[PDB]
Write an enzyme that holds these catalytic residues in place. Structure first.
Site, PDB file in Angstrom:
ATOM      1  N   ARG A  36       0.830  -1.188   0.000  1.00 59.13           N
ATOM      2  CA  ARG A  36       0.000   0.000   0.000  1.00 59.13           C
ATOM      3  C   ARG A  36       0.879   1.258   0.000  1.00 59.13           C
ATOM      4  O   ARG A  36       2.075   1.206   0.242  1.00 59.13           O
ATOM      5  CB  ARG A  36      -0.862   0.025   1.233  1.00 59.13           C
ATOM      6  N   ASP A  61      -3.812  -1.330   8.508  1.00 57.99           N
ATOM      7  CA  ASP A  61      -2.937  -0.240   8.900  1.00 57.99           C
ATOM      8  C   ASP A  61      -2.180  -0.601  10.170  1.00 57.99           C
ATOM      9  O   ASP A  61      -1.000  -0.270  10.278  1.00 57.99           O
ATOM     10  CB  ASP A  61      -3.746   1.039   9.149  1.00 57.99           C
ATOM     11  N   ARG A 245      -7.470  15.658   0.797  1.00 59.28           N
ATOM     12  CA  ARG A 245      -8.443  14.586   0.826  1.00 59.28           C
ATOM     13  C   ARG A 245      -9.642  15.054   1.666  1.00 59.28           C
ATOM     14  O   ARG A 245      -9.472  15.707   2.708  1.00 59.28           O
ATOM     15  CB  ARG A 245      -7.813  13.296   1.462  1.00 59.28           C
ATOM     16  N   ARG A 308     -13.088   2.477  -4.019  1.00 61.32           N
ATOM     17  CA  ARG A 308     -12.333   3.536  -4.690  1.00 61.32           C
ATOM     18  C   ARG A 308     -11.920   3.200  -6.140  1.00 61.32           C
ATOM     19  O   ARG A 308     -10.732   3.128  -6.503  1.00 61.32           O
ATOM     20  CB  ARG A 308     -11.069   3.844  -3.842  1.00 61.32           C
ATOM     21  N   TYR A 341      -4.915   4.578  -3.763  1.00 63.30           N
ATOM     22  CA  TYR A 341      -3.869   5.592  -3.638  1.00 63.30           C
ATOM     23  C   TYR A 341      -2.974   5.642  -4.874  1.00 63.30           C
ATOM     24  O   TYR A 341      -2.854   4.643  -5.598  1.00 63.30           O
ATOM     25  CB  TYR A 341      -3.018   5.312  -2.385  1.00 63.30           C
ATOM     26  N   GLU A 360      -2.183   1.750  -6.495  1.00 63.63           N
ATOM     27  CA  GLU A 360      -2.629   0.505  -5.846  1.00 63.63           C
ATOM     28  C   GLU A 360      -3.577  -0.241  -6.781  1.00 63.63           C
ATOM     29  O   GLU A 360      -4.542   0.341  -7.295  1.00 63.63           O
ATOM     30  CB  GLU A 360      -3.392   0.778  -4.548  1.00 63.63           C
TER      31      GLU A 360
END
Ligand code: DAN
Length: 381
Positions: A36, A61, A245, A308, A341, A360
């Site tokens: 990522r 994460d 963002r 996304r 991303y 990504e």
């Protein structure tokens, strides 16, 4: 200079640690499970260096993460890979260095690549949840540099933990993700994001840190509002302008007094919609004769969720405020475990202009050469 290639392959990469031992991840065959947060910087030699989180065990994460680097000297056709920054290995479940932002700059005559990542060891929750301490004792923000065109990286001893501690109202700080910039006067600028201590009414703010040498850094006195806080900064007539963002429409503010006050920048403010939750996006400038054009990538997010989809390239007319979709370069639904991303990189070396993107792609990081679109982007001014 390849049109498309895979930089890091999910469940297809093997890395070794500082002693030479393989890092057994959770991918098939003990490979790294997921990649990522790609950051890309291109040097004056034409070398492409790509950083990304090597999330060895899960896309999460809060997991075990090292910063991987890939270097290509043949235009993105083949990639030489290694770990650039290792986490501290205090906790095999949670130790992590993550979310790279890179800068390629000439510092007092030396071409240098800088990479900054956040570092945590025992925190098991998202960084926004730790607001008691100034700063959080688990956190740090580390900076590595390369002076040999991306081959070796070493740690820079910085005053960054000190300026955050001296500020006294910041719990943790992270780069804006993607790439930073070198201003026309020579100063290095990292866009940053920060979580404020629990007594400040805004949880998150955006700002930047700057340095002349890469060692001593400074924070401006003011703060931009936070929104989804990942952001990039571009220099426009020595205003500095960020692009942030946000769930829904992206935001863009301008500083005319070097970070003391920010006001909305209409040519880019609320121009692209990333819909639900928001995504990181990359924003850079491309010179077009004596004017400038802003190139931007982020996800269209047609499913209005964490998938996304449709990571696209846009051109922003900085004068008229017009926005145009130039290319939907990854027109696919992403993996909701961590998707969307990207990072752009433009360079003109002697008379060769290149525009590249890294993004990504279902746990992998892909590379595309987008230079064929430069005529169209350069006309938008
Ligand atoms: C340090 C860290 O958590 N970064 C993560 C970021 C963060 O969780 C969010 O911006 C709330 O602060 O979110 C995401 C994400 O795909 O949306 C990816 C980043 O790796």
């Amino acid at each position: 200079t390849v049109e498309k290639s895979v930089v890091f392959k999910a469940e297809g990469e093997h890395f070794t640690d500082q002693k030479g031992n393989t890092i057994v991840g959770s991918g098939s065959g003990g490979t790294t499970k997921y990649f990522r947060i790609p950051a890309m910087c291109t040097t004056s030699k034409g070398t492409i260096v790509v950083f990304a989180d090597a999330r060895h065990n899960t896309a999460s994460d809060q997991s075990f993460i090292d910063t991987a680097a890939a270097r290509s000297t043949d235009g993105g056709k083949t990639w030489n890979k290694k770990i650039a920054i290792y986490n501290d290995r205090v906790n095999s479940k949670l130790s992590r260095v993550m979310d790279p932002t890179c800068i390629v700059a000439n510092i007092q005559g030396r071409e240098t690549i800088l990479v900054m990542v956040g570092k945590w060891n025992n925190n098991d929750k998202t960084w926004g949840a730790y607001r008691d301490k100034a700063p959080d004792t688990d956190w740090d923000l580390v900076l590595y540099k390369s002076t040999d065109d991306g081959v070796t990286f070493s740690k820079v001893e910085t005053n960054i933990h000190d300026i955050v501690t001296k500020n006294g109202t910041i719990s943790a700080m992270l780069g804006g993700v993607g790439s930073g910039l070198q201003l026309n006067d020579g100063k290095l600028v990292f866009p940053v994001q920060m979580v404020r201590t629990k007594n400040i009414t805004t949880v998150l703010n955006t700002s930047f840190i700057y340095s002349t040498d890469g060692i001593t850094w400074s924070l401006p006195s003011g703060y931009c509002e936070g929104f989804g806080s990942e952001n990039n900064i571009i220099e426009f007539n020595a205003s500095l302008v960020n692009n942030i963002r946000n769930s829904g429409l992206r935001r863009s503010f301008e500083t005319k007094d070097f970070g003391k006050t920010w006001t909305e920048f209409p040519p880019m403010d609320k121009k692209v919609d990333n819909r639900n939750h928001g995504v990181q996006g990359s924003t850079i400038t491309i010179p077009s004769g004596n004017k400038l054009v802003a190139a931007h990538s982020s996800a269209q997010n047609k499913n209005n969720d964490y998938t996304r989809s449709d990571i696209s390239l846009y051109a922003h007319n900085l004068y008229s405020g017009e926005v145009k979709l130039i290319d939907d370069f990854y027109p696919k639904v992403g993996n909701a475990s961590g998707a969307g991303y990207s990072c752009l990189s433009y360079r003109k070396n002697v008379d060769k202009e290149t525009l590249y993107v890294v993004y990504e792609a279902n746990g992998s990081i892909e590379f595309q050469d987008l230079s064929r679109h430069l005529p169209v982007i350069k006309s938008y001014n």
